[PDB]
Structure formats: structure tokens, C-alpha cells
């Protein structure tokens, strides 16, 4: 029961890795921006020192491979970059584990722009256009992950919504700052636990809420 | 850890073709990335912030490392690699 | 729980000593080790050719 965006009836959990930072650069050769591997390039570009981190979404592979809802099939991952770019992933991509192979998977952002498999029947990674709401299911809950929002158990939060046909969570995969709350889709923010969680542990807490709500 | 002649590294699946095969072992078992991304998850979990957790690790070579809750493990990978080299050879890391 | 940052040197080498930030105490420690090994080798050699 694989899940694309084009069967908007069924019950899904949509994660939106929002305000990501994976950005390409031209050195003959093609690199992408890490804070660790180059800082003089950030200073010459005049960027902020801190927010050139695709390590956060590469660590948020764990919601793609959060097995007891992804091996149930009921999860789907979209990514929206600070460069305004929406990347779909398929719920059966076996993502590259190491960051050097994830660095090598910049052909989706630069060259190939949609990857096939070795037998090449189902597309894995896509560079689709905005908004997210059109690709979401018909009824869809309106949730971003803030900190100073009211805290609630995501078990009870998913359980009290009887059949809202999905649950979408906009998680800001940035270093510092503030996510687009009133800009696009979310009128109410649900806060997770009492501490300033990182993006990866926020996604994992919501994924495990979905597991123990929908009985893995 | 391993020597290059001048340099010390932590054994990856990716920093070498056959340093692991020269040492005898196979390359699939030299994965420090997964204990890195476990250590990140455990030390960003809320139970660690609440102070109800501590993280011990034990290497396949039989080396036990105690990991304080108060530590800030670095977020990228090769920063953690350079941390693990000095931990494995100086047996201690201060703040 | 408070969260401290770990102090460690980048491109660590155990065989080299630590980079002390003073060039007049690291230098005296270097040249103390140098005189100790050269004095030991020197007087070892002169007592064994005396033998």
C-alpha cells in the first residue's frame, strides 16, 4: 500500500520538513553548502554563519525510516527549503545513510531533478512546485511544531481527531529562527514537550505518537 | 583509530577503500555514523534534558565509554570523528 | 540539564605533544627533552668506548 499524494482519500501522516537548508554551488564541479566543510565561502557569500546545515534534514531521515508507521506505509515526507523548493520523497526510498552519500545525492537538486530506480518504474525524489495544501489530503489538520505553543500529548491529539483523513505537521528543520506560521497553512501551533527540542526528536516524538495512536 | 603517514582518523566505511581490508576486517563493520546518530537522538530526547538518562557505550573492541548527560555532542559527523579520536587516545574529554 | 561544549583539539595527534599557546614554555620543554636525550646518549657512548 504505497502512498503518493494522488490518493487524497486515505488516512496519512504528512511530515513537512520546512525551511530546510540544502543549497547547491558551482566550484567544473558541484558542491552543496555545509557549515563544516567551508566557512570562507559563507563569508564571501555574506550568508549567516550558522544556517547552512543540511545535517538537520539528513538527521530527519529518521522519520522517513521510522519503521512502525513507514513499514505500515501510512507516512509521507515533503521538504520545503528556504529556497522555496518542494521535494517529495517516496515512502519506500532507502535514503543514503552517510552524509557524504547524501552530499552526492545533489543530482536531484541540480542535474536529474527526478530520480528513477535501477529498474526505473516508480519515482523516488521529486522537485514539485508549491503549495503543500493542494498535495495534501482533502481534510487535513493544521499543525506546526513550535515551542511556546501549548503542549499536548500527540497520542491524545491524534486520537481525538476521529477521521480527519490525515495529520500534517510542519516541522522547521532550521538551526535558529522562526517558521512560517501565518504565512501558508497553519493557524494553530501545537507545541511538543517542555524543552526546546531539535527537529529530529520533534519528528520522532510525533511519529511515535502516531504509532501508539494508530496501533503501530 | 588509525595512522596515516602524520594523521589519525576514525575508521569509516568511506574514508578508505581498503584500510579495513589491510587490517583484516570488512568494511561493512566500520560504521561510527550510527552510534553518532544514536548518541544525538538520546541526548536530544526530552528524558535526557529532564535528567533521567545516562548513555554508556561499548566498542566492539571492548572499550567502555561513559557519556555524561551534560555533553553537547557535535552535530556534523567529522567533528564527532575528531572528538572520538581524542577520546580514544586521551581517555578523557573536558568541557 | 545544563549543556557544556567539549574542549578538544582538531587534527589530534598523540605522538606530537599538545600545542601550548606559549612559545617560551613549550620551547623550554622541547629543549629540556632534547638535552635529556642528547646528554643521555652522549655519556652512554663515552662510557662504553671507555669500556
Amino acid at each position: 500500500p504505497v502512498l503518493t499524494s494522488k490518493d487524497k482519500i486515505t488516512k496519512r501522516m504528512i511530515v513537512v520538513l520546512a525551511m530546510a537548508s540544502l543549497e547547491t554551488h558551482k566550484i567544473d564541479k558541484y558542491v552543496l553548502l555545509n557549515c563544516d566543510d567551508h566557512q570562507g565561502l559563507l563569508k564571501k557569500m555574506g550568508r549567516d554563519i550558522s544556517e547552512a546545515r543540511p545535517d538537520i534534514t539528513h538527521q530527519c531521515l529518521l522519520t522517513l525510516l521510522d519503521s512502525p508507521i513507514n513499514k505500515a506505509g501510512k507516512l509521507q515526507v515533503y521538504i520545503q527549503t528556504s529556497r522555496g523548493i518542494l521535494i517529495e520523497v517516496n515512502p519506500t526510498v532507502r535514503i543514503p545513510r552517510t552524509f557524504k552519500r547524501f552530499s552526492g545525492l545533489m543530482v536531484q537538486l541540480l542535474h536529474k531533478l527526478s530520480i528513477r530506480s535501477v529498474n526505473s518504474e516508480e519515482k523516488l525524489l521529486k522537485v514539485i512546485k508549491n503549495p503543500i495544501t493542494d498535495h495534501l489530503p482533502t481534510k487535513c489538520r493544521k499543525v506546526t511544531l513550535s515551542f511556546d505553543a501549548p503542549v499536548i500529548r500527540v497520542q491524545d491529539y491524534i486520537e481525538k481527531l476521529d477521521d480527519d483523513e490525515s495529520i500534517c505537521v510542519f516541522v522547521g528543520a532550521m538551526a535558529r529562527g522562526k517558521d512560517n506560521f501565518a504565512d501558508e497553512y497553519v493557524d494553530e501551533k501545537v507545541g511538543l514537550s517542555n524543552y526546546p527540542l531539535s527537529a529530529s526528536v520533534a519528528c520522532s516524538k510525533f511519529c511515535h505518537g502516531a504509532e501508539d495512536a494508530w496501533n503501530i | 583509530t588509525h595512522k596515516i603517514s602524520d594523521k589519525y582518523v576514525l575508521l569509516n566505511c568511506d574514508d578508505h577503500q581498503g584500510l579495513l581490508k589491510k587490517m583484516g576486517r570488512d568494511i561493512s563493520e566500520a560504521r561510527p555514523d550510527i552510534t553518532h546518530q544514536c548518541l544525538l537522538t538520546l541526548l536530544d530526547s526530552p528524558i535526557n534534558k529532564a535528567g533521567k538518562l545516562q548513555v554508556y557505550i561499548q566498542t566492539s573492541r571492548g572499550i567502555l565509554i561513559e557519556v555524561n548527560p551534560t555533553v553537547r555532542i557535535p552535530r556534523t559527523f567529522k567533528r564527532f570523528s575528531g572528538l572520538m579520536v581524542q577520546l580514544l587516545h586521551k581517555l578523557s574529554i573536558r568541557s | 540539564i545544563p549543556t557544556h561544549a567539549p574542549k578538544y583539539e582538531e587534527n589530534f595527534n598523540p605522538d606530537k605533544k599538545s600545542y601550548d599557546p606559549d612559545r617560551t614554555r613549550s620551547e623550554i620543554n622541547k629543549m629540556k627533552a632534547q638535552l635529556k636525550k642528547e646528554r643521555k646518549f652522549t655519556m652512554k657512548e663515552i662510557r662504553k668506548d671507555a669500556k
Partner: peptide
């Protein structure tokens, strides 16, 4: 207090030497 901000970079020896 490091709320996911990451521990900072430390300048290299040659970068501090070029001064």
C-alpha cells in the same frame, strides 16, 4: 545553553597564524 544551535567552530592554527 545550546538549544540545537550546535557547538561553535574553533579556528584553525594557520588561520589564527595569519594575523
Amino acid at each position: 545553553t545550546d538549544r540545537f544551535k550546535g557547538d561553535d567552530d574553533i579556528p584553525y592554527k594557520e588561520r589564527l597564524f595569519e594575523r
